[PDB]
Structures are given as structure tokens and as C-alpha cells.
Design a protein around this ligand. Structure first.
Ligand code: NOS
Ligand code: NOS
Ligand code: NOS
Ligand code: NOS
Ligand code: CA
Ligand code: CA
Ligand code: NI
Lengths: 314, 317
């Protein structure tokens, strides 16, 4: 298996992505996770990450791993409308079985002392083999590592698989001050995203809205987790999807198996100016600008089957 | 021993916790029917979630099946709502989509699709051998329709109506640019129907207004205790519903009273409803009209008793 670190923002799909990575131990060795106070209040996101990890560790062969809270702060905050979703998951019955919460209470102190950004840097730089970073939240943490360590960090990254942006499709950030061209993860911290997408020597796979828009969350599919209620992960995943696109989950599925999508190189820049299109990921013709491999035409059925099967790991 | 009960609800998360409380306490309650109104949910979703809960309960605790109808009631004041979706999410929850339960619901869904909720309530009440208790957790439109159509022929068959709604000596929860914050949502949705119900003589009414429901909030550590009971389908269900709206136990408290009146003492108050288009439209006010019908308003509910009742009830299966 290959080493993977999950850098997420604590929304429901970030957690479905976590389940996908953690459950596929033959292909992925999940060596760490960091949570950013973005799509969630870092507090609850950290706790849900820990509760899911402990539920899996006590039920399948998933080694414990470090979990760190990132110190990253937003340039433009997510809608408070969907930030406290990690708070709700923190209270779900399936994540509060006493034997699992007891394990989390026993290992929480070791994890509370990590600073997420430094943890991402250390896990990547100190690994024997290269590490794949699955980024389902903003790019603030990867940018921080690039700024502090440069090539000492990027040379140890196998690839960075990123959920974010919108290249040849409309974005999803519709506010009185914006024009709808930007996507939320990039809009949260444009400058950090600029740093990541313009870094030479860093291989980037980009799951922008171009690909995620083609694999929507539909009721008949979500109801199939009801056929697997003897599996804790199916009660977990079905409950989170029961609450609009499998953005982060698609991104993580690619990490598990690249047959999820073909990718095409595009030089991607980011608008960091305080304008209506702030956060937009745009094609640039600047000479020698670094290429990003944008996912295209994802294999929907393959992904949907992968998630249902993965949710039977325990 | 058990008494006949009909649940008249609006499909939000607490309407469903109320349903589980009534249905799980078979020593005390015989649930003979339910109707769903297109108020705090899109009614088709509320209809399906009611059916799916009933079928899970029939297959796991022998709950007898009963008719479920969608009401044709339309709002006087619709919510400018972004929360009428907590029935849709629910319809897709894994614990309500177990094959053996979905198969049974699919088998009986067409028969229930044919009912019209308002007429169904009237028929359930009027054709019953023993009197019927109506637990109303959504707006009062359906009870009002029955009173308007059948009058005493309907009310004489009602044991009592236990209603969640209103605010008597505390502020309300309807905060809009044109309101003064003294009205509560179930009444504000259809004030005229509420006025009809509260002013009907010869109808016994118990009222769980914000005065009592404000005293029992949904708190995270208590909700997390349902995780100690995941071997019970109803604990995964109730816990999941209270988890996503950690909010008060408005409807659940109302249903708990139907199960055991020790949940709260009640005090008689003559209640009128503001129907004119004023800032306090929908408010429940104490009227001084001579000989006006009394409503028994719940006071100082037994919170610990209620919280224990719900955790216990959720171990029924
Ligand atoms: O409406 C929403 N609800 C929950 N999460 C959302 C929503 N919109 C965006 N994201 C979050 O931002 C990225 C996609 O733009 C994904 O990483 C997702 O977690
Ligand atoms: O009466 C009905 N019978 C069968 N399905 C129905 C009915 N009403 C709504 N649906 C809905 O249409 C799809 C199934 O054809 C499902 O989405 C179901 O929720
Ligand atoms: O008690 C109250 N609390 C909060 N807002 C209120 C209350 N009463 C009336 N409004 C009104 O509803 C809008 C905010 O939702 C404001 O326009 C305010 O005038
Ligand atoms: O903020 C809210 N979210 C969801 N349901 C609500 C909210 N406020 C009120 N109710 C609904 O209206 C009655 C209490 O006024 C209860 O019947 C409850 O189901
Ligand atoms: Ca995310
Ligand atoms: Ca209600
Ligand atoms: Ni239908």
C-alpha cells in the first residue's frame, strides 16, 4: 500500500473521503490526518476524525494514526450555514459507542499536542517512501509546508490529489460580493491555493467541479446503505450522505484507484485579488507555467460501487 | 388498558421522535393512525418517513399497522423555510431503509396514498368504538377542518387533544420583519384554524406551549447516551434525529404526556388566537370573554422523567 495523509475541512464529504481511504488498507496506508477549522469548527472536526478512526480501529485492521488540528485561519470563511455539520456528526449514535469513545478519550491527549501544519510537513518529510496527500479542504496547509520547506517537502510528495476549483464550469461561491466563478475550497484561502497550483516540482491531480458535477448524491443510491446495516461503516456513510455532490469522496476514490478518472494537464493559476472572481482557478498561458492534471469524465459507477463495497469493511 | 391515539404531525425531526414515543409505549398507547401536513416538511417525505418507521416497528416490536394520510391543508403563513428538508434527509437514512421494512412499506403504500388526511382523521375518530386522543404536533388545520365539517359528531368522540403550540407567558419564536416575536410557529402557520380549535366548547385540550417546552432543551451529552444503546434500532433512529438538531424537545414532550400524564401538571387558561394581520398574528392570548372554553396549559414539566422515558422507549427494539 502507499502512504497517504488526509488534509480535510470537516464537512460530511470530508468524512466519507476519510472512510474510503481508511477502509482500503490493501491500497492505502493512512498515516495521518489534519483538520482545518474551515467547513467546520476545528474542535468538532477533530473529534469526529478521532471517533471515526477509533470506531474503525476497534473493528477492522486499521492502525491508529496521528490527527492534528491545523492553525490555518480563513481569508474568506465558509457559510456558517454548513460549518457546524461536524457538530452534528459528533453526536450521532454510531460514533458514540462506549468502547470506541473510551479509546478516543485515551489517545486524545497525544493528538491534541500536534499542530496540524507541522504534522503534515513531518509525516511527508520523515516517511521512508513518498507520500500522497489527499486534500479535501482548503490548500492552506500544503501552502504552509511549501513556504516553510520548499523542495525538502515537495520532493517527498508522490502527488497531491486536490478537491477544489472549477476550470471549464461555473463555480459554487454565490455571495452578494462574488460572480459565481470560484469554488469554496479555493475561495477560503486564494493565496495559499496560488502557491500550491504554481509550485513547480509538485505533481497535482485536481478534482474540480468539472468532474465532481457529474457524480451527484442521489436518493436510490444512498438508500442502498440500508441494505448493509450490519456494517458500521454503512450506517456511518449512509447517515452522512442522507444529509449535494460527492466532491471529496470522488477525490479520495482516485487515491484508492486511479481508474476513477483520466486526467489532462492544464496550467492553473488563481485570482487572489479582492474582486468578484476572487478565488477563481483560471487557465494561464504564461510560458513554462506548471501543469496540473485535471480529472475528466470520472467513472461514476466504478466510484459508487467502490464506496458501497468499502462501507462493508466493518 | 391502552387508549386509542392518532398522531397529527408536520414531519420535522421532533414530530418523528414524538411518533416513536407514542408507538413504542404499547402498554399505554394504541396508535390507530397518523396524518402528515405539508408544513415543516414536504409532505411526501413526511408520509414516507412515517410509513418507514411504522414498518420497522411492526417487524421488530409487533406494532400493529395503521392508516397514514397526507393532509390537503395549505398554509396561511408558510415558513420562509430552509428547514422543511429534515424529512427528506430522514427518508434516506440507512436504518429506515432496511429491505424487509421497505418491502412491507412498498406493499401497503398505495392503500395509504389514497387517504386524504383530513377526512382520515375525521373517520378514525368518528368510527372508533372508544374515544380517541389526538396528539397534534404540527398546525391545527386538520382538527379545525374536522370541527368545521362535523361539529359535535366529531368532538364528542375525542377524549382530548394534546397540542404542541403557542406561547402564553413567554416570548414566541416567529421572528420576521413584520412580527413582534410573540407568536409560535405551529399557530402562526394557520391562525384561523388554531382559533377554531381553542374556542371549541366541549373539546378537552391540553397545550404544550413554549412556556413548558423551553424547560427541556436537546443537549449533546444526553443525545450521545443513545450511543450506549446501538443494539436497538430505535436508539440509532432517535439519536440520529436529535443529533442533527441538537432546538427543543417540543413535540416529544407533548407525546410523552399522552404516554404518562405525570410528565406535567396543567393549568386552565381561556385561549384565543390573534388572526388579524398584526405584528402578533398567531399569538395565543388569554381572553377575558365570559364563559370562554378552557385549555389546560402544561406547566413545569418533569424533565428528568421525560429524558429517562425517551431513553427507555428507545430500547423497545
Ligand atoms: O453546500 C455545501 N454543503 C456542504 N459542504 C459544501 C457545500 N458547498 C461546498 N462544500 C465543501 O466545499 C467543497 C466543494 O466546493 C468540498 O470539499 C465540500 O466539503
Ligand atoms: O405511490 C407511490 N408509489 C411508488 N413510488 C412512489 C409513490 N409516491 C411517490 N413515489 C416515489 O417515486 C419513486 C418510486 O417510483 C420513489 O422516489 C418514491 O419515493
Ligand atoms: O424576539 C425577537 N427576536 C429576534 N428577532 C425578532 C424578535 N421579534 C421580532 N423580531 C424581528 O424579526 C427579524 C429578525 O428575525 C427582525 O426584523 C426583527 O424586527
Ligand atoms: O428552528 C426550528 N427548526 C426545526 N423545527 C422547528 C424550529 N422552530 C420551530 N420548529 C417546529 O415548530 C414547533 C415549535 O415551534 C414544533 O412542532 C417544531 O416541530
Ligand atoms: Ca471538504
Ligand atoms: Ca412539529
Ligand atoms: Ni406518493
Amino acid at each position: 500500500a502507499k502512504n497517504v495523509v488526509l488534509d480535510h475541512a470537516g464537512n460530511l464529504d470530508d468524512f466519507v473521503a476519510m472512510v474510503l481511504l481508511a477502509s482500503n488498507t490493501e491500497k492505502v496506508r493512512l498515516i495521518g490526518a489534519l483538520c482545518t477549522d474551515a467547513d467546520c469548527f476545528v474542535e468538532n472536526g477533530f473529534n469526529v476524525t478521532g471517533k471515526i478512526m477509533c470506531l474503525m480501529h476497534n473493528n477492522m485492521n486499521l492502525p491508529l494514526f496521528p490527527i492534528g488540528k491545523s492553525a490555518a485561519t480563513a481569508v474568506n470563511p465558509f457559510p456558517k450555514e454548513w460549518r457546524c455539520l461536524a457538530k452534528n456528526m459528533d453526536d450521532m449514535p454510531i460514533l458514540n459507542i462506549p468502547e470506541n469513545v473510551e479509546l478516543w478519550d485515551k489517545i486524545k491527549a497525544e493528538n491534541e499536542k500536534y499542530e496540524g501544519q507541522q504534522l503534515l510537513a513531518d509525516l511527508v518529510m520523515n516517511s521512508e517512501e513518498k507520500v500522497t496527500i489527499c486534500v479535501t479542504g482548503p490548500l492552506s496547509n500544503v501552502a504552509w509546508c511549501i513556504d516553510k520547506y520548499g523542495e525538502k517537502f515537495t520532493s517527498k510528495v508522490e502527488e497531491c490529489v486536490i478537491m477544489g476549483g472549477a476550470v471549464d464550469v461555473r463555480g459554487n461561491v454565490f455571495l452578494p460580493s462574488t460572480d459565481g466563478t470560484a469554488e469554496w475550497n479555493i475561495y477560503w484561502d486564494p493565496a495559499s491555493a496560488k502557491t500550491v497550483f504554481g509550485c513547480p516540482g509538485l505533481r497535482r491531480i485536481m478534482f474540480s467541479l468539472d468532474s465532481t458535477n457529474t457524480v451527484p448524491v442521489r436518493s436510490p443510491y444512498v438508500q442502498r446503505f440500508g441494505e448493509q446495516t450490519n456494517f458500521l461503516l454503512s450506517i456511518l456513510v449512509g447517515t452522512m450522505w442522507a444529509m449535494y455532490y460527492a466532491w471529496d469522496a470522488l477525490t479520495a476514490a482516485y487515491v484508492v484507484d486511479q481508474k476513477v478518472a483520466n486526467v489532462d494537464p492544464v496550467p492553473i493559476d488563481v485570482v487572489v485579488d479582492k474582486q468578484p472572481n476572487e478565488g477563481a482557478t483560471v487557465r494561464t498561458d504564461a510560458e513554462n507555467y506548471p501543469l496540473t492534471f485535471v480529472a475528466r469524465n470520472p467513472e461514476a459507477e466504478f466510484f459508487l460501487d467502490m464506496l458501497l463495497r468499502s462501507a462493508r469493511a466493518c
